[model samples]
Target: IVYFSTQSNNTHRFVQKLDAESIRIPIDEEERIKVDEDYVLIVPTYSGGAVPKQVIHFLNDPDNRKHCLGVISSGNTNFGDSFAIAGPVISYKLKVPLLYQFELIGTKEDVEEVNRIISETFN
Candidate 1:
C-alpha cells in the first residue's frame, strides 16, 4: 500500500488498520519514491477537490506508477459529489481501477472489504 497523509493523518490511521505493509509518501520531501512490487495507492481528498500534492509527486515517478494496481480514497461525504474524488482521478490517470473509498479510519466492515479487495480482487 501507498498513502499520503497530511497533518490530520486520517489516511495513515486507515493504513495502520489494514493488514498489508505500506509506504508513506513524504509529505514534504521531493525525493522520488519507487515501489518494486505491485501495490495500491491511498489518497485523501482535500477541500474543494484538489488531490494531495505528495501523492501526485510520488506518482510522477514512472517506476512507482508502473507498479500501482489500484487506488483507495478517503473523504467525508459532506463534500457531496467531491467526496473521495481522488480515487477516480488517480484511476483515470494511471489506468488502474479505483478499488474503494472510505471515511477517516473507516469501520470494521470497510476494513474487511479492503482486505478482500487487496487479496481477492487484485489477486
Candidate 2:
C-alpha cells in the first residue's frame, strides 16, 4: 500500500510512480480506513518537523498502526534539520522504518532510484 497526503503535486508525482495501492489520507473525516496488511506511507514535511494532522489521526487508528512498513517523506533541503523530520517521527511512532526521503519535486533519477529500492525491499 502507498498512503500519502499532498497539498502541492510534488508528493503526488512521486506516489504516481509507485506500483502499489495508494490511499490519500485525511480523506473524509466521515470516512475511515482500516487495513489489515502492511503499507508504505508517503508524506511531506511542513515548516520543518510537523506531521500532517490527517496522517496523525489516521495512524492513531488501532487498525492502521501495525500495518505501516515504513514512511517516505518529501521536503526542501533549505529547511535544514527539519527537512525530512516527518518520516523519522512517523516511523518511530509506528515502530516502522524510515525508508526514504526526497526533495519537494524529485528528479527522474530520484524516482527511478526509489522505485528500484521499493522493488528490492518489498519483493
Candidate 3:
C-alpha cells in the first residue's frame, strides 16, 4: 500500500498495526510519488481543519488515481464536518474512493481506534 503521512504518528501507527506492506512517502514529496502501482492508501494528520502538506501533495500527484483510497485523520476535535473537509481532496482533486475516514477521538485512545479502523479496512 502507498502510505502518505505527516508529522503526526496517528496514521503511521495505524498502518503499522495492520501489518500492511506500505511505502512511507512524505506528504510534501508529491513529486516522488510513483503511480505504477494499482492500489494506494493516503493517510495524514489533520491540522486546522485541513490535511498536512504531504497529504496535499500526494493527492495532487499527476498519476492515474483510479486505484487510490484516502483516510484523513484528525487529532481530537474540529473535524466534525469531515465530508466538507475531505470532499474537495477526495472528490474534486484526487477523484479516488475514500473507503473510510474519521477523526481519532479522546486523549490517548486514538491508537486503539486507528488500529481498529485499519483492521476493519484491511481485514
Candidate 4:
C-alpha cells in the first residue's frame, strides 16, 4: 500500500483509479495520517515549482522519511522546467527514488506504467 499527499484534484483523480490502497493527506492539514509501512507518495506541484506545504511538513517527520520509498509528482507542462519539482525535492530530501513525474490527470498509459513500477519495486 501507499500514501498520497495531494494539494488538488489532479493527484486525487489519478490515485482513485489505482488498484492499490492509499491514503490522502488532508488538504486542510487538520488531520495526520500515519503510515506503518514503507509507501509511495503522489503529490502535485504548486506555484510552478513548490511542493505543497503540508507535504513538506509531513515528510519533515523523521518517522515518515524512514518509510518513504519513492515519490510521483503531477504537473502541467505550461510550467516548463519548474513542473513537477516536488518529486526531485522530496526524493533528494528523503533519499528516496523519484519514481515518476506525469502531466496533470495522467493518461491510462501513465497509470499502467506507474503500477508496473510499484509492482516491481514492492512486490
Q: Please tell me which predicted candidate would have the highest TM-score against the true structure.
A: 1
lDDT of each: 0.86, 0.75, 0.52, 0.78
lDDT of 3 by residue, 1-123 (tens): 666545655556556654446777654553556566555464544545455566566555567355565443334445455532543455446655454454542234544554455556553
Candidate 2 lDDT, tens digit per residue, 37-67? 6677888887523787667778888888877
Give residue 65's error in model 4 in angstroms.
Answer: 1.4
Task: Order the candidates by lDDT, highest first.
Answer: 1, 4, 2, 3
Q: What lDDT tens digits, residue by residue, belong to model 1 across residues 1-123?
A: 888888898889989999988888887866556779888888889864458777878888888889999999989898888889889999999999999999987899988999889886567
Candidate 4 RMSD to the correct structure:
1.9
Encode model 4's per-residue lDDT on 34-61: one tens digit a residue: 6678788888888723787778767877
Candidate 3 local lDDT, residue 116: 54
User: How large is the C-alpha RMSD of every model relative to the true structure?
Assistant: 1.4, 2.1, 4.6, 1.9
Which scores better on TM-score, 3 or 4? 4
Evaluate model 1: give its lDDT: 0.86
Which regions of candidate 3 fall more than 4 Å away from where they truly are?
A: 27-31, 64-66, 69-75, 82-84, 105-123
- Model 2 clash tally? 0
Q: After superposition, how far is residue 30 of candidate 1 from its true place, in Å?
A: 2.6
lDDT of 3 at 59: 56
Point out where model 1 deviates above 4 Å.
Answer: none
User: Cα deviation in Å at residue 56, candidate 4?
Assistant: 0.9
Clashes of each: 0, 0, 2, 0
